[PDB]
Amino acid sequence: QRTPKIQVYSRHPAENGKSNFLNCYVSGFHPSDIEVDLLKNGERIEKVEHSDLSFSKDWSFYLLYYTEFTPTEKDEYACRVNHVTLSQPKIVKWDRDM
Amino acid sequence: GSHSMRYFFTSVSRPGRGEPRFIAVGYVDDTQFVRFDSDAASQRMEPRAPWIEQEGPEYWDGETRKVKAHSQTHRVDLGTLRGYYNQSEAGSHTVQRMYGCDVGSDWRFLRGYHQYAYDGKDYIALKEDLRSWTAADMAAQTTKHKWEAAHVAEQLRAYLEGTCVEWLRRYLENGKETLQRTDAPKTHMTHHAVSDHEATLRCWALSFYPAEITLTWQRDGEDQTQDTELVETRPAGDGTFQKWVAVVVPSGQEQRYTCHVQHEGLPKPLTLRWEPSS
Amino acid sequence: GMSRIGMEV
Ligand code: NA
Ligand code: NA
Ligand code: NA
Ligand code: NA
């Protein structure tokens, strides 16, 4: 079993009030079953899509989860991941500088 | 430049009920162009790039027959492997397969490969000679003797050196507008104070294609790895990739630090420094 | 285009 690595980021450099896309890239995990949600103010975002499962040279899997979003000064965005290797879901907050 | 065509397959057993979950994807370089998902409604191989939609119904019928045959081979293999390893019928297990071919700048065959894994570990792989097999353990050694007796490597070698390269050249021509275009990284540097006397400089590479790239920091013209962070290259979601590299520096000393960017789309590597008025 | 080779373990 290998635990997922997570990056949460925007497709384009963030500007408050300008529409964009919120990504959560999960990689380096095994087995492939995984639960990924994008959150807005701690609540699950409903329209979220993901890439088709693929894997790296070490056989670990990777997926991209994504949705449209409009960054603002007051909204907090995050990615929440659960996997067999995790005891509790891991929440990674979106920071526009990363 | 050089190019590749690669197919990836994953099957995951579901012993409580039904057949394994099966997902197949095909790539040309870093571009996904076809997919199959056993859970999807069509039960067909589906297009994922505009240039493959040019293919007619005989292509889609042929690829659907081949991918469904691959799914059944994986279903049989999951059963055989459970027996080779004396495993319970109650647990979920996984098989993964990747194969494909590489061509050089002249679009001629460079190398082929066919690798197989059970539960995330190497099981059996074709060697670079396209004649021999690497078996990781004694269960894979049983499979190796079976495949030597059935002329498997000969059939794989014929596909990898012939058919695989012929399809790749066809796709490179039909999808030339994007497949043969390199997108050089769009670079910039950001500054993030961490105190009144230290700051992080972050060097960004955005919207590039293909994914291969190198970002390095130098201080006074020599490589710097202390106090640096380099994230894994990540998809933007529009077919291009992103990466960044960061270094923590004493405030006022930013001009000593340079970020160096190497990519196929850049004739000469780029050098960036922090613009102090910003 | 995919391979048609079927080889079972
Ligand atoms: Na868990
Ligand atoms: Na070329
Ligand atoms: Na230094
Ligand atoms: Na990664």
Side-chain angles (χ1 to χ4, degrees), chain A, chain B residues 1-244 246-278, chain C:
Chain A
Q1 294 178 347
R2 285 171 253 175
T3 206
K5 296 232 266 293
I6 303 161
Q7 293 192 65
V8 56
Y9 54 102
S10 58
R11 177 177 306 167
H12 310 288
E15 289 194 74
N16 290 329
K18 188 167 300 181
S19 66
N20 205 321
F21 300 83
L22 178 62
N23 287 334
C24 181
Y25 182 57
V26 285
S27 65
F29 60 100
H30 213 286
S32 60
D33 284 358
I34 192 163
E35 190 83 9
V36 182
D37 291 305
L38 290 176
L39 310 178
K40 175 183 188 183
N41 301 134
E43 292 291 307
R44 180 174 182 271
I45 297 175
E46 288 299 317
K47 210 227 101 287
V48 173
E49 298 176 277
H50 63 82
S51 64
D52 290 323
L53 185 71
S54 187
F55 51 84
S56 305
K57 48 199 168 192
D58 66 1
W59 305 108
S60 69
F61 294 103
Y62 63 86
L63 290 165
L64 177 68
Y65 282 75
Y66 60 93
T67 193
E68 276 249 50
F69 90 132
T70 296
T72 64
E73 289 172 358
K74 292 163 181 174
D75 299 305
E76 305 240 1
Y77 295 90
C79 179
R80 180 180 63 203
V81 178
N82 207 353
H83 185 258
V84 63
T85 61
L86 298 170
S87 312
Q88 206 201 358
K90 181 165 298 173
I91 298 182
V92 179
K93 299 173 188 65
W94 175 57
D95 180 332
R96 67 191 64 212
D97 303 323
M98 293 164 87
Chain B
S2 66
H3 299 276
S4 66
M5 183 175 71
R6 301 177 179 143
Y7 285 96
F8 296 76
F9 306 87
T10 304
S11 290
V12 183
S13 69
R14 295 189 297 171
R17 183 175 71 237
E19 297 186 18
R21 173 70 179 278
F22 169 80
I23 300 171
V25 296
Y27 290 87
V28 167
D29 301 328
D30 294 314
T31 300
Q32 172 191 98
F33 72 103
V34 286
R35 62 97 74 159
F36 184 93
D37 186 334
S38 63
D39 270 7
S42 71
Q43 298 293 303
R44 308 282 295 175
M45 194 74 181
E46 301 175 53
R48 286 300 187 267
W51 46 263
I52 205 65
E53 294 191 23
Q54 297 174 22
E55 303 293 345
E58 286 181 33
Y59 178 86
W60 299 102
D61 182 65
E63 297 306 289
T64 297
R65 184 178 354 277
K66 291 184 226 157
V67 83
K68 289 183 165 184
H70 277 71
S71 80
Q72 294 297 332
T73 294
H74 280 195
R75 180 195 51 80
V76 171
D77 287 350
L78 280 155
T80 305
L81 294 157
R82 188 191 60 85
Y84 287 172
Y85 293 99
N86 194 20
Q87 289 162 334
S88 169
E89 219 170 332
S92 172
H93 298 270
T94 308
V95 284
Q96 289 160 269
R97 184 194 310 264
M98 186 278 293
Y99 61 80
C101 53
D102 290 352
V103 300
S105 50
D106 57 358
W107 293 9
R108 292 188 176 269
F109 176 81
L110 261 187
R111 72 187 64 84
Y113 35 80
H114 185 114
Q115 306 169 14
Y116 190 108
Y118 182 57
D119 286 336
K121 296 174 287 185
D122 293 346
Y123 182 79
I124 196 170
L126 187 64
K127 298 199 206 264
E128 297 304 316
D129 66 359
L130 315 183
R131 297 171 181 274
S132 306
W133 299 97
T134 296
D137 67 16
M138 302 305 297
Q141 185 65 30
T142 293
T143 298
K144 173 171 174 171
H145 288 317
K146 183 178 174 190
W147 293 357
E148 292 169 335
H151 315 271
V152 174
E154 292 168 13
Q155 299 178 52
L156 280 178
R157 177 179 173 226
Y159 165 83
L160 298 167
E161 290 184 21
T163 309
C164 187
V165 172
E166 291 158 14
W167 279 119
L168 176 53
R169 298 168 171 154
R170 172 183 178 84
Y171 299 151
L172 288 167
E173 170 66 30
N174 292 353
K176 64 187 194 305
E177 181 179 23
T178 53
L179 301 178
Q180 298 184 51
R181 187 185 82 209
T182 61
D183 301 353
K186 303 185 191 311
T187 63
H188 76 280
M189 196 184 294
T190 60
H191 164 284
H192 312 278
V194 295
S195 77
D196 71 341
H197 57 283
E198 294 122 347
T200 294
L201 302 178
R202 184 167 285 116
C203 178
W204 295 85
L206 298 172
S207 219
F208 58 90
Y209 180 95
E212 173 62 34
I213 197 168
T214 298
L215 294 181
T216 58
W217 276 105
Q218 288 180 23
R219 194 269 283 183
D220 292 332
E222 181 197 299
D223 280 356
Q224 163 103 25
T225 79
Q226 288 256 134
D227 300 298
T228 68
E229 178 179 11
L230 181 69
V231 299
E232 292 313 303
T233 302
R234 65 200 193 184
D238 60 6
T240 70
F241 295 87
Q242 312 181 341
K243 199 182 189 68
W244 59 252
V247 62
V248 176
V249 312
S251 291
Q253 302 305 306
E254 305 81 6
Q255 302 309 298
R256 298 188 187 268
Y257 298 84
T258 52
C259 168
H260 300 264
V261 183
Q262 300 168 260
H263 187 266
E264 181 179 346
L266 298 167
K268 62 156 271 301
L270 295 181
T271 297
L272 281 90
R273 216 176 300 253
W274 187 57
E275 315 71 27
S277 93
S278 29
Chain C
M2 274 171 22
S3 185
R4 186 178 33 204
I5 309 146
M7 44 201 122
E8 288 169 351
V9 305

